[PDB]
Design a protein around this ligand. Structure first.
Ligand SMILES: CC(=O)N[C@@H]1[C@@H](O)[C@@H](O)[C@@H](CO)O[C@H]1O
Ligand SMILES: CC(=O)N[C@@H]1[C@@H](O)[C@@H](O)[C@@H](CO)O[C@H]1O
Ligand SMILES: [Cl-]
Lengths: 554, 561
């Protein structure tokens, strides 16, 4: 973990020392989890808050942010948290995670290719750095601290008190936690269908290790554990070469060997695919495997040609007999392999969104190969595809009818929504407001959707700890977690949202059973705030904060 | 075969019409198989020879060359040969072709060799007669030009001995121009068919040149159908060795068409390897079905560049191991392939004939490579074309030496008794004897007589068909003297060079059969006479006795017995 230490990029905004003239000693205060504090300006806190009061269920993860700002050098700034105690009972401080909220270069408003102008760029607080044990802060700088309390499941309900000690070579901040009588199940038991596409090739490139070696998997374990502890349900698999035509910094390579032998037979080898899938299942991501893609963005299919001992490409489009023959041959081998492994029922062939013609022709092919193959799609609403798609994810702008949703729930199908570079808000860009990430989970509860999908968990740019920009899209679009298995503010807020989606579900189960129709109509009145057309009437921060309080009263 | 028709390149030497002023009508004559007749000059034949007398054994292939030269246009020149009669040799056994022209250059300016890179502009160029074109049925000759005709008589085995007579008819613009008379004395000895010859001929095959030239998929049905008559030329010359590339670019692409790997090298992401031999197997079976079945030579454990390609599953891409003989990494990489290869070859029944094949390198390298092979399987056969080393004489099952160096007679006999193969080669180093397109035809035959003189098992050359871009028109290349990279042509057309080499090989077989008969009969004199004749084929004696003279004298001596 010493090799995981790093330096931030230079701040493109210079520090005005006159703005710091009024700061006479180092300051410390509780801040808000809704705010990313600027590095180069004093915290906008005009008198310090020494106490923080939190409420949570047993089993819940709950966070707070403190801020330190200093007109002099602070050597070896450290945070530590006491045990929390309530009479003779204790939440042990092993369950409490601290991190420095570190800075990354971002830009602004979001689709299409970009030239970064470094004139348009700024440092923003986003990285939860729980690895570096101390930081030295330069004079005239501000530094956030993130505190995560993982409340154990067997914790006694009641009032817990504890201390956050900040040192540099001070103050104590007070932490109060009301633990309620209700229990939140562990992440492995959450209903919420979270899908954040994984990029293992980004990790092998960043650390310069052999793909799918022991070192590669050792590096991925804590990183993918971040996804599984957020309720991650879906394994991403690239079953061919460059499903997305190298749109990310690191292209996805094939996890399947496509070897066309010189006698006309094919040898398909799934060694990589199998290792990746088994690895992710051992971490608790086991609900679904999504296989990309039969319809890549460029319709050119790589295979290893033995006769010439080289890579070749079939150029073939859905609706062609050649496309049908090429995919039938692989999909029928793949079907047998999956059935041998016991993964067939959960494996989905996964599309991205194309002219209607294309998608139906691709579907014919899949069905000829095996009638029971499951299929998924993230794209636009089409009535034509509602009975064929076992997992259907729709743009936030479009809606399924309530009858469509129940028909799909009745049939055992998954129904979700996504955002990407199209939507200014809500989103998980590095300059997005933190509460927008939590908002996304509340929106799923409002819509009776099964969850939320985003296209990039960890498709890291070149220097993801320093600069979140990319040659396409708004900064942060390509990843939500960082090298070192470091979380972001964005993923932490999303996880709080998902925990509340589970609370709502548990509360409605209890209220329906007891005939408490009033409590149900109130939860639904509160859920009305999470409409994507109503964000100028009620800000995402305000909606999220009001809704949290309502659910916690029950 | 209509798609196999072609046009020659322009002659870079213009025609001197004063040199033709003496030629008043078309001339037709028997010529010599020792001469490549120049296109732009009259045949150097001071008066026409109408009769050709040949002698041969039953089973022997024997050739003659006629020449036509003309001061006027000859439209649709054609040759045809009658049955030969006494009993009959049917004319189905007789092949005719036009001796067509290819651009050639010359030795290195110093005249001492022909190796090293070259620009064509720094060297002469000239058209030379070399292609035996048996496919094109007629040619139109321009005024003031000369054209050779090659005639091959394949004497069937059951042919009755005695005097055979027949006619070669040459026609143009409809009419007959001349009949030439062909006489053939068939002797009461029998030469076995090529499949039964002892002579160890190794001419390295390049299947990738054929797939490129015809633009077909490698190791497809079309590719093999094209290669069948072409590789049959090699088998009918006594070819014994199948060339296999068991890794990517054994010679680092030194020829126009690089050799690809006939073996899939797949490093799986779980630490195991998968090797697949589907190409290798198809190529080997194909070549064995044509009668090339004695030996398979696998190139190479020691390429110049020392960079070994493999398919890396984890990254789904090609990678290269840089590892040198004498390194543990080289040893681990090759051991793993060679042990899998060993099992495969045993499953197929090919292990006893398969040789791992080196080219020449520092002594250190070769012995370290040998340790690796032996660790993999102690019974792996090994071969080498290079320099003489006493150190390697028990380890090399097939040892081919430069013509300049010698094994002792004891070394040869020890190697023969152990069942090993011992040969020599030439390449770009030797000005003569050689098979450059400008080399004298008899030099190709000479090579086989030299093997008989040295008690060697045969002869090796590095390129049967490593065709340049336009091999029918221009035999030059970016390296070496013209013709160094191939001996046969598109259309399964033979060269003068391969036809003469084949005659030499037939005589090597005759010598062997005659010595078997003379030892058994105690006729020690006839044996001492054959050896006195074989003394002419020394590579230091070519300024005392020209290769042509030596070959012609020797042929006569053997044919008297
Ligand atoms: C379901 C989804 O997110 N699809 C694409 C995604 O592949 C990526 O290109 C993204 C860039 O932000 O644009 C989205 O249209
Ligand atoms: C064994 C042998 O023939 N080796 C090389 C051959 O690879 C080729 O480069 C040739 C060119 O004429 O030169 C030979 O020395
Ligand atoms: Cl090569």
């Amino acid at each position: 973990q010493t090799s995981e230490y790093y330096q931030e990029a230079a701040n493109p905004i210079a520090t005005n020392p006159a703005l710091w003239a009024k700061v006479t000693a180092p300051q410390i205060s509780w801040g808000s989890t809704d705010i990313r504090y600027k590095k180069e300006e004093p915290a906008p806190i005009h008198s310090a808050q020494k106490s923080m009061n939190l409420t949570a269920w047993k089993g819940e993860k709950i966070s707070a942010q403190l801020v330190v700002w200093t007109p002099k050098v602070l050597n070896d700034l450290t945070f530590m948290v006491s045990d929390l105690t309530s009479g003779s009972a204790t939440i042990s401080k092993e369950n409490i995670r601290t991190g420095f909220v570190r800075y990354v270069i971002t830009d602004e408003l979001a689709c299409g290719y970009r030239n970064s102008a470094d004139f348009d760029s700024t440092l923003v607080a986003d990285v939860i750095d729980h690895i570096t044990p101390t930081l030295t802060l330069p004079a005239n700088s501000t530094q956030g601290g993130w505190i995560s309390v993982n409340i154990p499941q067997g914790t006694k309900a009641g009032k817990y008190t504890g201390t956050v000690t900040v040192k540099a070579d001070l103050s104590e901040l007070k932490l109060n936690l009301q633990v309620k009588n209700r229990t939140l199940p562990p992440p492995s038991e959450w209903a919420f269908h979270l899908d954040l596409w994984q990029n293992p090739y980004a990790v092998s490139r960043y650390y310069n290790v052999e793909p799918f070696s022991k070192k590669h998997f050792d590096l991925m374990r804590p990183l993918m554990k971040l996804y599984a502890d957020a309720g991650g349900k879906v394994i991403t698999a690239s079953i061919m070469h460059k499903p997305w035509n190298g749109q990310t910094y690191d292209a996805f390579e094939s996890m399947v060997t496509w070897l066309k032998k010189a006698d006309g037979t094919w040898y398909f080898d799934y060694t990589v695919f199998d290792k990746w899938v088994e690895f992710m299942m051992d971490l608790g991501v086991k609900k679904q495997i999504s296989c990309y893609s039969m319809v890549p963005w460029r319709l050119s299919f790589q295979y290893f040609d033995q006769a010439s001992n080289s890579f070749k490409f079939l150029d073939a489009k859905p609706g062609e007999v050649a496309y049908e023959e090429f995919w039938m041959n692989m999909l029928q081998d793949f079907s047998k392999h999956l059935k041998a492994k016991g993964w067939f029922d959960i494996t989905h062939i996964a599309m991205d969104e194309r002219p209607m013609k294309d998608m139906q022709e691709t579907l014919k092919v899949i069905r000829k190969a095996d009638k029971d193959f499951k299929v998924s799609l993230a794209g636009t609403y089409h009535k034509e595809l509602l009975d064929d798609l076992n997992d259907y994810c729709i743009t936030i702008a479009e809606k399924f009818t309530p009858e469509e949703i129940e028909a799909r729930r009745k049939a055992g199908k998954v129904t979700t929504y996504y955002t990407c570079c199209t939507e200014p808000r809500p989103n998980t860009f590095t300059f997005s407001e933190p509460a927008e990430a939590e908002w996304l989970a509340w929106h799923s509860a409002k819509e009776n959707l099964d969850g939320y999908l985003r296209w990039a968990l960890n498709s890291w740019v070149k220097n993801p700890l320093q600069d979140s920009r990319f040659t396409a899209w708004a900064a942060g679009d390509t990843y939500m977690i960082y090298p070192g298995a470091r979380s972001s503010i964005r993923l932490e807020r999303l996880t709080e949202g998902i925990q509340f989606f589970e609370k709502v579900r548990i509360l409605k189960e209890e209220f329906e059973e007891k005939g408490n129709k009033g409590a149900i109509k109130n939860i639904d009145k509160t859920l009305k705030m999470f409409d994507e057309s109503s964000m100028d009437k009620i800000s995402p921060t305000t909606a999220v904060n009001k809704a949290k309080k309502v659910i916690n009263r029950y």
